[PDB]
């Protein structure tokens, strides 16, 4: 139906995919003002770890500081194969993709990391109030020579 | 066309709904709900290749194993996601039950999961399960190694 209220949740819908697509997309030096695309009080980070645990940086300007690290941890990275997923919530978005770059952690010899990943983001008034990683933890072990367990099955 | 996706949707949206609420014997029938030649399994993997079990029948085969080695199995917490494309869904969920694998102690596992589900004909056509390895290794008891993060 053409009401006002279902062209509202269209336009919200529009403008919050222009703005996932901005951060899947953004590369190089962009990188170090993605967190502009944030709420004041947005979180982002990497809900699967090896300790089991999420790591959160919590509010626009901590984003901003982790930025100038992880350009530095993944110094030429690019995500690909990139799939939107719009949601029945206007403001609650999915991403598909992969991603390849560099990996240069500290204590650990340089590598080449891929891995596949999903994102989860949430937003309110049109800023992005909570950006979720999920990927699998052992492509990362791998890309660092950390031996990776296995299960026998 | 309009009318057809919004059925077909909330069709599969169902089909997902009961998928997702299945437990204990009734797991041994949820291969039903799969095309003949649908593919399930699990994605992420200590190998890094996908556990893909291919057809309707095979997978019906699979979840008599999977009763013994998950014996209580349940999804809580669960949110599912409809997508633009009426046949995609995404599901999150937590999930908990014993372990009990063969030449490892039997341990309690829970996880944080991400499902996709991609519908052929109101059947499911793929699920892929996402979830962190790393979580299986300690209801194992398996030693995980932990990266260095600092700051
Ligand atoms: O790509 C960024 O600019 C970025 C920014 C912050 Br802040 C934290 C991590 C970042 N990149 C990693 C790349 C490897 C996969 N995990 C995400
Ligand atoms: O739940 C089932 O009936 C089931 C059926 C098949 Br065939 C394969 C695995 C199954 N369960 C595991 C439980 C732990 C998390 N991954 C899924
Ligand atoms: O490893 C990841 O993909 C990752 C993801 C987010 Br999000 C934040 C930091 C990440 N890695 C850090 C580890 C410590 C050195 N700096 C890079
Ligand atoms: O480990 C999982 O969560 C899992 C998921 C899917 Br799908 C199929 C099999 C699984 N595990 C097997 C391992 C060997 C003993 N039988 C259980």
Same mark, same amino acid.
């Given at each position: 139906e053409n009401t006002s209220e279902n062209r509202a949740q269209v336009a919200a819908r529009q403008h919050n995919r222009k703005i996932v697509? #901005? %951060?899947?997309?953004?590369?190089?030096?962009?990188?170090?003002? @993605?967190?502009?695309?944030?709420?004041?009080?947005?979180? $982002? $980070?990497?809900?699967?770890?090896? !300790?089991?645990? +999420?790591?959160?940086?919590? $509010? @626009?300007?901590?984003? $901003?500081?982790?930025?100038?690290?992880?350009? #530095?941890?993944?110094?030429?990275? =690019?995500?690909?194969? /990139?799939?939107?997923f719009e949601t029945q919530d206007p403001n609650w978005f999915? =991403?598909?993709?992969?991603?390849?770059?560099? /990996?240069?952690? +500290?204590? %650990? +010899? @340089?590598?080449? %990391?891929? &891995?596949?990943?999903?994102? !989860?983001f949430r937003f309110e008034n049109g800023l /992005?109030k909570? #950006?979720? *990683?999920?990927? &699998?933890?052992?492509? #990362?072990? @791998? !890309?660092?020579?950390? *031996?990776?367990? *296995? =299960?026998?099955?």
């Amino acid at each position: 139906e053409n009401t006002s209220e279902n062209r509202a949740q269209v336009a919200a819908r529009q403008h919050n995919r222009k703005i996932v697509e #901005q %951060y899947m997309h953004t590369r190089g030096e962009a990188r170090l003002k @993605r967190h502009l695309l944030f709420t004041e009080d947005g979180v $982002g $980070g990497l809900w699967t770890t090896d !300790s089991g645990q +999420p790591i959160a940086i919590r $509010g @626009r300007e901590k984003l $901003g500081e982790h930025a100038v690290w992880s350009l #530095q941890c993944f110094p030429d990275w =690019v995500w690909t194969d /990139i799939q939107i997923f719009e949601t029945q919530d206007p403001n609650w978005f999915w =991403v598909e993709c992969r991603g390849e770059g560099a /990996i240069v952690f +500290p204590g %650990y +010899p @340089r590598g080449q %990391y891929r &891995n596949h990943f999903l994102h !989860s983001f949430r937003f309110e008034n049109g800023l /992005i109030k909570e #950006q979720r *990683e999920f990927m &699998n933890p052992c492509e #990362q072990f @791998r !890309s660092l020579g950390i *031996e990776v367990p *296995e =299960v026998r099955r």
